Amino acid sequence: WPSANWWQRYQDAQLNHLIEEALQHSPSLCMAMARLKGAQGFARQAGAIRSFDLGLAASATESKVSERYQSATPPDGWNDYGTLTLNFQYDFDFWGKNRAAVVAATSELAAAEAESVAARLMISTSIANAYAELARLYANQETVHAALQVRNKTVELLEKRYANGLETLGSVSQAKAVAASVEAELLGIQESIQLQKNALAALVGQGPDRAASIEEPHITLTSRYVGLLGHRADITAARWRAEAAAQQVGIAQAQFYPDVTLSAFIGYQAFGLDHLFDSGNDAGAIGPAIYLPLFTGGRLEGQLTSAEARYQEAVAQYNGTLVQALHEIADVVTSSQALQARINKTEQAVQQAEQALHIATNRYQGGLATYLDVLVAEESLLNNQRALVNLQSRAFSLDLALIHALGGGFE
Amino acid sequence: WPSANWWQRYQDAQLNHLIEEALQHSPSLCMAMARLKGAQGFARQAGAIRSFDLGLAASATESKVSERYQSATPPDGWNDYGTLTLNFQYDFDFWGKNRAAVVAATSELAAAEAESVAARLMISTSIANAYAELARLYANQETVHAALQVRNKTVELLEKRYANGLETLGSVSQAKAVAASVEAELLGIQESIQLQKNALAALVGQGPDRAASIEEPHITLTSRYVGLLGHRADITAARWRAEAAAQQVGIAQAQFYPDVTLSAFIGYQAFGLDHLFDSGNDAGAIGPAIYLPLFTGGRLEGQLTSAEARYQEAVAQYNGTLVQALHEIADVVTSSQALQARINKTEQAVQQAEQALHIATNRYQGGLATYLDVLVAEESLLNNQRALVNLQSRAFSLDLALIHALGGGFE
Amino acid sequence: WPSANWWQRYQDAQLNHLIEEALQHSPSLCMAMARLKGAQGFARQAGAIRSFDLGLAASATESKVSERYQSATPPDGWNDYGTLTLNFQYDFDFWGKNRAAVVAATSELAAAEAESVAARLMISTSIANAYAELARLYANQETVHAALQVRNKTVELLEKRYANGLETLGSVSQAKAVAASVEAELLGIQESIQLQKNALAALVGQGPDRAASIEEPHITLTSRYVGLLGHRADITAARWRAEAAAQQVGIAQAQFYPDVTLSAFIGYQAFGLDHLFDSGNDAGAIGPAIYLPLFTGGRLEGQLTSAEARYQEAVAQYNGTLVQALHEIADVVTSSQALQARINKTEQAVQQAEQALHIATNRYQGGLATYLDVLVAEESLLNNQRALVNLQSRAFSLDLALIHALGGGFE
Ligand SMILES: CCCCCCCCO[C@H]1O[C@H](CO)[C@@H](O)[C@H](O)[C@H]1O
Ligand SMILES: CCCCCCCCO[C@H]1O[C@H](CO)[C@@H](O)[C@H](O)[C@H]1O
Ligand SMILES: CCCCCCCCO[C@H]1O[C@H](CO)[C@@H](O)[C@H](O)[C@H]1O
Ligand SMILES: [Hg+2]
Ligand SMILES: [Hg+2]
Ligand SMILES: [Hg+2]
Ligand SMILES: [Hg+2]
Ligand SMILES: [Hg+2]
Ligand SMILES: [Hg+2]
Q: What is the CATH number that goes with domain C51-96+258-294?
């Protein structure tokens, strides 16, 4: 199914180059890279909760103690003190709170990894879809330009006839109005082409000088040959975020249980900075502490409610993502299955209108039909030719819609 | 005005069932439920600030004191100590800071309650609007299919005539081009119908198998029979959020004032863990503390500026919501008042075009008018019939727009 | 180039008044003001990190000390204690962490200042663009109303003719269908005009009574006469945010280095509240402390990774903004350069169609051409006249697009 570099299947080295440029260096690329690195840093920070912490502390203080407060034998006046210690703290994690925190953070990272794939897909498909439109525009340009050549040929026939007393000025004027209108349409298409090149340049992270070297597409379209949702990075990301939320419910539950910590220090403390290192002025301690909240008035309880709510939200978000992915795939299937008959009937309208015009103009070049018959046929032909070109372009768009709906093929 | 289950007024048990399904269980539903529960948990957490807090603390420590630091008679060497205490803390709230915090949180909850109603409205109206489009599509299907039957009948008349030397091949070819084009339009409509069923399935939280049982709508539209803004949950929510912001200004102001707290503990402390419970090794304390910031270099001041700014923003947000609600209601009124005359003139175009076609085809079936007169009339008729069906559908859309603009009728 | 009050160049005091109203008082205005004040408050709060902090603390405690814990000569029973102190804290900032924090906050403020300019631009251009559409609608109203007068004149000619046996009922019916359709189009345009007035009222922060005094625009369009990006407030804001992020990388780096603080207090502490102020019960201290983290298990490291990621994101965001601004300017140039030829060819279609109609109707008023020739010409004329009016309106839209792309002229 969809390749990793799936755009290569269209055999357009243009398209290949545009996507390749965007995926090597472009702002959308860099932002996606950055957002993944962010999640990596966040995961790293979270994992620290399961380590011990070590720090060095030192102080020098000039202090005067109250004479009648907490010491029966306080030193007199202002004296200097110093300390210099190595300090240690470790949280025991008896209920798994901190482990759950790390699982939540790593689940977020897994979601971030999936989102980086989704970002690659969003870049490549945004370019391919813009390219599809460029191709559609160039097709409409060819169709309208060819019609213009004909409209001009009709004016000049009708003018030669009018000159020889074989046609009216009304017909001539109408034909000139038709030709001017078709040319106006062509100019609009040509503007759109250039606008679309500008957009492609921006999509690949470049200024508008990149647009100057964009040429007519040459796309080769080949027919291809619930279980279909496993390459959807959005579903994967939402899965992992629902896992992270579940873990956060666990954290909130574990906050009701005793927290057991271990602290320690070792170093020197002295009355007199010049005595900091004297024999006997070492100090140290180690021991566990436990804290058990007994009544918080709603803090622990409310936090648990909020964590449950976030889990429920995340599950609903996952469900929504599944529903939306199935909708997207269902639509691609619907439209893909409808396309051939649409094209078929529109081809038939083109061909019958082309016959109509051929007969109308033969008859005109021989004085049996009016100019009006020609105008009506010309208009019907052009309208159907444009409809056809747009449906042919739709085949490419639908192939791209399938690739998007399947989530690409990054692997 | 708008009922609680307002969609029932259209007398389409289909529509009723789709909305009912979505409101019983669907991802959009669940996310809305979850976001309300979240606000409930947040409110619960906030209310804790006005309670006292109670906790149990215990520790066992092996400690060596410096010989010449803070004790004139320090114990020698490394000794074991233990503590086990019940701890209590209460913030007095003399300036109402904490009360304002709870008012802010409960105001947010009231806003969240209003937003849950808005979410129900967004679900039901999104479904009804998608349904409106489904109905419009089925109407265009009937209109275009009926026209197709006629186009085919015209081909086969013109072919019988051409066969008998009474018509040209040009006419025949044009008529076939017209019929193929009308059929191509029909196929496009039929695709849209299926796409719209897919969308309805997704809107009610279901996979695309739900779409398979969606049938043609049968909507019954009945005419109905600043003060009109009280069912707007968005205005209510913004109201309450502006209240919450106002309270937060109060909090920021109160941070300049003295904070008075009460702390207490009771328990046991001992040199020697085996002596933890000995007579005389109980320890306890109670008392108030007061802290008054005297200079913070911009922390309190900046926090007040930020809180005032948030209030101003929230008031502007409320004002914007009022303006937008009035715009929405004004537009519904504008369009509702315009609709009948639009329909009237478009009905007149339909009927006159239908007469034109009838005369053109009678005249054709008797050799007085061209095929061209028939083509022009057929085209004019179909264009006007589609315009009419779209305006008739607009009546339903406008009724739904009114319900949305009034904020529904949940009560 | 673009003035500060650039809309004045269109010489429409209407437009001037609408924009002026919105910029004096409107919800969008107020929200923008509020968001700037917020950033000001945040900057103020951040700057506090470089000041010292002063506070007053007092306590009164009833306390019972354990007999055999930490004092060899503990007081007996429950006794009262009091304290009353002035407390001082100052962070030294040897590595520039706190300075970087303030630079980051002031850079955010500079970005907020730029965004307030962008908000002014978004307000004025949203109004001008809505006004452009209002003008376009009024032009289409004039064009369609004038065509309607003609369509009605054609019905009544064809009816007088049909009455005298000189025309068919088919022609009459077709002409009536055409007129009804043109009137239906007019009614739709008139609805749109009123909807557009409603939108303008909302855009200037007013209820729908403001819409009642909005009249036909009278815009005067005058031709004007990478380096072009310096008035883009979005680029400026993104610049400053990338600076703020860079500083935050510095903060994260500086967190690995020793933190040196200074603390002090002075006051009174006493056993016996009635002795709080007794000679010798003063207490005080001053001194520096240093903390150096030695191992944090990923906290410092992960924070640095996250800060680098945010910098990278912000740089990419800046780059994206540059690319998007260049795209916007490139499009304005593309479309501006295309416009004249589009208008020219469309003017030619109008004029030739107008000749066609004139000849068709002269010939009709003299029995040489059919009604059909008239219908075809009338339709072609109207279609081209509307296309022209829309292209003329486009000239105004493009001028506004240029002003937007250049970022206005606030100075
Ligand atoms: C990473 C280094 C950790 C060890 C720090 C040990 C600090 C205290 O250590 C010391 O202090 C005394 C007072 O001078 C001496 O009497 C000692 O012999 C000595 O062990
Ligand atoms: C919720 C329980 C709160 C009460 C805890 C009281 C702890 C201290 O209580 C005690 O400690 C002493 C030392 O053993 C005794 O001499 C006592 O008679 C006793 O009151
Ligand atoms: C802003 C005011 C700062 C100064 C506070 C000084 C508090 C301690 O000050 C004092 O305490 C004693 C005990 O009564 C006396 O013996 C003193 O003479 C006196 O200096
Ligand atoms: Hg990057
Ligand atoms: Hg990069
Ligand atoms: Hg739920
Ligand atoms: Hg649910
Ligand atoms: Hg404001
Ligand atoms: Hg304001």
A: 2.20.200.10
